[PDB]
Design a protein around this ligand. Structure first.
Ligand code: HEM
Ligand code: HEM
Ligand SMILES: C[C@H](O)[C@H](O)[C@H]1CNc2nc(N)[nH]c(=O)c2N1
Ligand SMILES: C[C@H](O)[C@H](O)[C@H]1CNc2nc(N)[nH]c(=O)c2N1
Ligand SMILES: C[S@@](=O)CC(=N)NCCC[C@H](N)C(=O)O
Ligand SMILES: C[S@@](=O)CC(=N)NCCC[C@H](N)C(=O)O
Ligand SMILES: [Zn+2]
Lengths: 411, 407
């Protein structure tokens, strides 16, 4: 069976066959679409089919499907599974795995870059201190003095689910959030729960509006441990505006390296619960969501005041006006400091080209429209007009519960 | 499977039970989501009628009444002999209001129960159709104080006697293909504008020529009619800050009146059912004015603003987009024509969702369509999980007549 997607700006029609290789489920049924829903101990039994499918893929890509090297590998993995109930990926298979998980990430607009990914194999790691060292190197390498390079660091896979490696942080670099007695929040409201955990685990908080959180690292199912990232490794950008000199006085900055650290990487049925990965920011992530979401820094009011907009009626579009200036300032600041960033126009355009390329060479490209369309100026970006099909391929990055909700405390 | 939806800005959680009365299909499966795809007999007829009558009598609190059973029996007999049936006026009004209520892509449904229904089922000719449509337009426009309305023409019979309005909206601007390959006026309406000319229309060939009506009665060849200009309310677009903005020569019409859809009630199909409410500002300022395949005015406006159009990262497109949308809202408000900005409309829709969950057990909603085409995440609907499903009575898409009509 074949499926068509149309772009309603250009009338380009594309044919998807890739969706046929999808097995995982979307959350949708024929009677209900759950397209906007945020989020809708494995045994020998199910493991070998998962392994075989991955190896078939891997060997196909390297033009060796059905080869002796292919068949011996299947043999070796099967034997290893039945005798140990799991198996180890070769380095080559791991790199292929991590790249393809990115390539398959239907909510990622930056996938044109998927084949350029620095993979750091941290499977020999055994302790939280070992984790800290690996993570420090990741940050230094990925940051590259502002000329960012995509990377992922992969810690040992899950075994019995009792010895998980986890990074308790949602990102390697993120700002603290502190609930005040008066109900207001100082710093980043999205990180209040985690900040409280850190403080309980012994962190001495500076209690400012932009305090870089410590790392909270769990090796081998043990209680997690605190570590401070060397400040010289944490690249930050002060936010100013090219025309508005008062903008610097708002006191805003952000970090340059977004590094998602709470997701689970699945490859050939293996689960990598600690796999921090980093690329670089699209401007609107910071300028629109982080700064202007009502539940985040929420600076719209303060910015609008200083611009002296008519704030008494929403139909003045004072919010829309402030938002643009804020996003101009983010992009300006990063570019002036030579820190890699991409605007939403450039990024979405690149994605369209990527997506078209993928249809031709791969037979499709799973894409989550709800997430791909930028959170400002949607319809003036080409992705708005692009029909997309969303489905799940493996390897993949998956959500997992925050570890403090599952972790068995040792003491 | 009594599903929950969460708002991630407010942490409000609603439980949906209404979805378990979904009649039709979404196009999605367990294996693929198609949420961003734009367009995914007597035996058939009686269960459809029964289902509708069941809702109807439940809503007036006479479920399982003599009146209810009588009406079921009565309709049942009518189908057996006539192969169809006719709705009582009350059922027609309920059906239309509920089609709107059920339109998962409509952000303005908080108004759903205040719909003026015009029964045009006695209409027999295109001239009669014209008359009904002029009355609709005058009533709905209401000197700028717009009132939602629908006019319903006779239902399909054998599919060979359909009533259709060939226009996509009662009021829209023409589209002409120029010698230099470009397009004058509205590119979305080029094909339709051709067909009008192909039929006899004398096009003044301007940037904003109101199209003639092309009306089809009882399956006949459609006929042209010109809406009395005095009935077409238009707004000159100016900016409250930029004097040069009025020089751009932009205008739009006050009355959006969708005319190419099909209203389905109790299995009965109304192929001609033009309906009208009023505009959200972004429909005009963002989509109609700034889509690349529409009026596409961004570059011209940014130019007049003297923005740095060298790099995309100056966000000149975004800056211009805002000002354009400020002007649209400003102009309509200044001329006392009803319009709603995207902040007010989305906030009202959140309140409506609240109401529907509380009083009805849910509200089908299509996030992809509900979230406005600018400033998405600063509107509350962006952070609102929505469940999409098809309830009936409903408005459905139907083919353009010209692809189907025998002459
Ligand atoms: C290199 C530049 C990149 C850009 C500009 C980019 C852009 C984005 C954006 C804007 C999102 C939505 C995030 C949000 O709204 O919170 C996203 C999501 C995502 N990205 Fe990328 N990305 C990049 C690199 C990467 C890399 C290197 C990986 C993995 C190796 C990756 C995997 C993902 C995944 C799995 C998601 C889904 C996140 C979620 O569901 O919360 N991306 N990306
Ligand atoms: C009164 C104020 C109203 C507002 C502010 C409003 C707003 C909107 C908007 C913004 C859309 C998206 C359409 C687009 O972007 O092209 C829409 C779609 C829709 N509306 Fe409403 N509307 C209103 C009245 C009505 C009425 C009176 C009806 C029917 C009686 C209706 C039924 C629909 C339907 C069926 C759609 C989907 C159209 C499609 O799928 O192309 N609306 N509405
Ligand atoms: C409810 C809705 O799905 C949710 O707000 C989504 C919408 N789209 C998004 N898109 C991106 N890129 N990031 C997000 O966090 C979200 N949030
Ligand atoms: C491809 C995509 O589904 C298409 O561009 C949709 C997106 N969302 C929309 N939303 C509204 N309100 N109106 C539209 O025409 C569209 N178009
Ligand atoms: C891994 S990262 O380079 C992918 C990315 N560009 N962003 C993902 C999360 C960043 C998050 N939205 C933020 O604003 O911090
Ligand atoms: C029937 S109308 O009141 C519903 C509405 N507000 N708009 C839908 C169609 C209008 C279309 N988007 C336009 O910009 O002309
Ligand atoms: Zn779906």
């Amino acid at each position: 069976r074949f499926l068509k997607v149309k772009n309603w700006e250009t009338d380009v029609v594309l044919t998807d066959t890739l969706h046929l290789k999808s097995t995982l489920e979307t959350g949708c049924t024929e009677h209900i679409c759950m397209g906007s829903i945020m989020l809708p101990v494995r045994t020998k039994d199910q493991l070998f089919p998962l392994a075989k499918e991955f190896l078939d893929q891997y060997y196909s890509s390297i033009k060796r499907f059905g080869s002796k090297a292919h068949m011996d590998r299947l043999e070796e993995v099967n034997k290893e599974i039945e005798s140990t109930s799991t198996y180890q990926l070769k380095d080559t298979e791991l790199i292929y795995g991590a790249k393809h998980a990115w390539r398959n990430a239907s909510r990622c607009v930056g996938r044109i870059q998927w084949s350029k990914l620095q993979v750091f194999d941290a499977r020999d790691c055994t302790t939280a201190h070992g984790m800290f060292n690996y993570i420090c190197n990741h940050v230094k390498y990925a940051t590259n003095k502002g000329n960012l390079r995509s990377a992922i660091t992969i810690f040992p896979q899950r075994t019995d689910g009792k010895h998980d490696f986890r990074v308790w942080n949602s990102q390697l670099i993120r700002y603290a959030g502190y609930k005040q007695p008066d109900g207001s929040t100082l710093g980043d409201p999205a990180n209040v729960q985690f900040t409280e955990i850190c403080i309980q685990q012994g962190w001495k908080a500076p209690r400012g509006r932009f305090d870089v959180l410590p790392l909270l690292l769990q090796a081998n199912g043990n209680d997690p441990e605190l570590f401070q990232i060397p400040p010289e490794l944490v690249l930050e950008v002060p936010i100013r505006h090219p025309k508005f000199d008062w903008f610097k006085d708002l006191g805003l900055k952000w970090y340059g390296l977004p590094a998602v650290s709470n997701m689970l990487l699945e490859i050939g049925g293996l689960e990598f619960s600690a796999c921090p990965f980093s690329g670089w920011y699209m401007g609107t992530e910071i300028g629109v969501r982080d700064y202007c979401d009502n539940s985040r820094y929420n600076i719209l009011e303060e910015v609008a005041k200083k611009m002296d907009l008519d704030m008494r009626k929403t139909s003045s579009l004072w919010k829309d006006q402030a938002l643009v200036e804020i996003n101009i300032a983010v992009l300006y600041s990063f570019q002036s400091d030579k820190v890699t960033i991409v605007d939403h126009h450039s990024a979405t355009e690149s994605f369209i080209k990527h997506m078209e390329n993928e249809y031709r060479c791969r037979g499709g490209c799973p894409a989550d429209w709800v997430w791909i369309v930028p959170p400002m100026s949607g319809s003036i970006t080409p992705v708005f007009h692009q029909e997309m099909l969303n489905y799940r391929l493996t390897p993949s990055f998956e959500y997992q519960p925050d570890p403090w909700n599952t972790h068995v405390w040792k003491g």
